[PDB]
Design a protein around this ligand. Structure first.
Ligand SMILES: Cc1nc(C)c(C(=O)Nc2nc(CN3C[C@H](C)C[C@H](C)C3)cs2)o1
Length: 110
């Protein structure tokens, strides 16, 4: 459905809008974080999700939400609590939560 993709697209932009520092909008730079992949099984970020979106890899809402949750859970897992990343993830989880709750309600009436 075009409206499903249209909704998914709008939702991801709302999610990106909460990341005012652009710290989740591209993959973690592995040149700067060489052990990142030692602990994180599946990295995720908003551009990768955008890529999945435009390739029709999100055919249901659950997979979209699951990748969102990875952006947040990865960041909390890897980063120590007293860091800017960890704090930003705690907040994104609450703000992202609400975005995804409203978006899922829209998908329900399709
Ligand atoms: C969600 C998350 N988990 C982790 C481990 C990280 C993480 O270390 N991100 C990093 N990004 C950069 C690059 N970045 C730095 C900014 C200050 C400016 C901007 C233009 C480029 C270096 S380290 O982010």
């Amino acid at each position: 459905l075009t409206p499903f993709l249209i909704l998914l697209r709008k939702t991801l932009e709302q999610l990106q809008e909460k990341d005012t520092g652009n710290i989740f909008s591209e993959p973690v730079p592995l040149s700067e974080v060489p052990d990142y992949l030692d602990h994180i099984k599946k990295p995720m970020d908003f551009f990768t999700m955008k890529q999945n979106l435009e390739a029709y890899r999100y055919l249901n809402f659950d997979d979209f939400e699951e990748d969102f949750n990875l952006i947040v859970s990865n960041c909390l897992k890897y980063n120590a609590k007293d860091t800017i990343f960890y704090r930003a993830a705690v907040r994104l989880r609450e703000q992202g939560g609400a975005v995804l709750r409203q978006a899922r309600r829209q998908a329900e009436k399709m």
